[PDB]
């Protein structure tokens, strides 16, 4: 299924911040009602893929929850319809193997095994004795940040949905394996499934069909990457300007996107 916000804006309700903690003052924001997301447009059609990306706390998580409906769209209109998977930034782990960690109601061979290769996780699991029957408890902590991410992807992906928002997978240190992944699963796997990609790696702008670029929850582009290097050519060459951006840690990213948008107001 496609989705269109047009002229969408979102202010701060009580209760939305301590939600906001978990997948990652607010009573002052709320008591003066101040806007989290203002004037969003964006219109992704079936099977397109969306990168956001932004400056630090511009909303990006957000206009994730505003899609999922934990946060409401006060004015504009919201459309899409269908199952949606979210794949929070915080990757989580329940108790189980790695396989009944992936796998939701329904077990079904070809689909898991494609998943789990395409993830990336076959490099992961013929490291352990037991491969996808290990054992996991609680939180997976012996595991590494990239490993919860790839397993923690593993099950959002593996979920039938219409629609899927991914919000930031690709942050941790092992990023030769997050270039494999991204291309494997994001863009071959996933290529005809509509897809949202919260990002700070600019291969992935690229390679997009849509890119939101957010800033002190406002909208500083919508549009394609071939307009966005014509149309914000500032931006475009202070961040494509670099050898290896997408090679920098999230954080040094992150800093430099959040300097790049402050600068070129
Ligand atoms: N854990 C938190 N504690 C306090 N305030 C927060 C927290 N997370 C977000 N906020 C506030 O809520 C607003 C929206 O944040 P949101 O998480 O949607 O931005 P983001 O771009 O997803 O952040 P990040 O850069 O961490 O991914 C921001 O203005 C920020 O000030
Ligand atoms: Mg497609
Ligand atoms: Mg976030």
């Known amino acids: 299924t496609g989705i269109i916000m047009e002229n969408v804006t979102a202010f701060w309700e009580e209760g939305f911040g301590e939600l906001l903690e978990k997948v990652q003052s607010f009573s002052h924001l709320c008591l003066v009602g101040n806007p989290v997301l203002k004037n969003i447009n964006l219109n992704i059609e079936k099977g397109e893929m969306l990168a956001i990306t932004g400056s630090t706390g511009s909303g990006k998580t957000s206009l994730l929850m505003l899609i999922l409906g934990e946060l409401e769209a006060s004015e504009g209109i919201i459309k899409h319809s269908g199952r949606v998977s979210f794949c929070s930034q915080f990757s989580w782990i329940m108790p ?18 494609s998943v789990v290769k395409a993830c990336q996780l076959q490099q992961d699991i013929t490291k352990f004795a037991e491969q996808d029957n290990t054992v996991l408890g609680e939180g997976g902590v012996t595991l590494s940040g990239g490993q919860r991410a790839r397993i923690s992807l593993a099950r959002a992906v593996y979920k039938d949905a219409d629609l899927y928002l991914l919000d930031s997978p690709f942050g941790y240190l092992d990023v030769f394996t997050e270039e494999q992944v991204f291309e494997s699963c994001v863009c071959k796997l996933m290529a005809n499934k509509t897809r949202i990609l919260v990002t700070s790696k600019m291969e992935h702008l690229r390679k997009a069909d849509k890119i939101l670029i957010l800033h002190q929850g406002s909208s500083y582009f919508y549009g394609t990457f071939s307009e966005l290097q014509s149309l914000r050519p500032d931006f475009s060459s202070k961040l494509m300007g670099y050898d290896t951006f997408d090679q920098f840690t999230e954080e040094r990213r992150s800093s430099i996107l959040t300097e790049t948008l402050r600068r070129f107001s």
């Open 96 to 113: 189980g193997t790695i396989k009944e960690n992936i796998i939701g109601v329904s077990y079904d061979e070809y689909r898991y095994k």
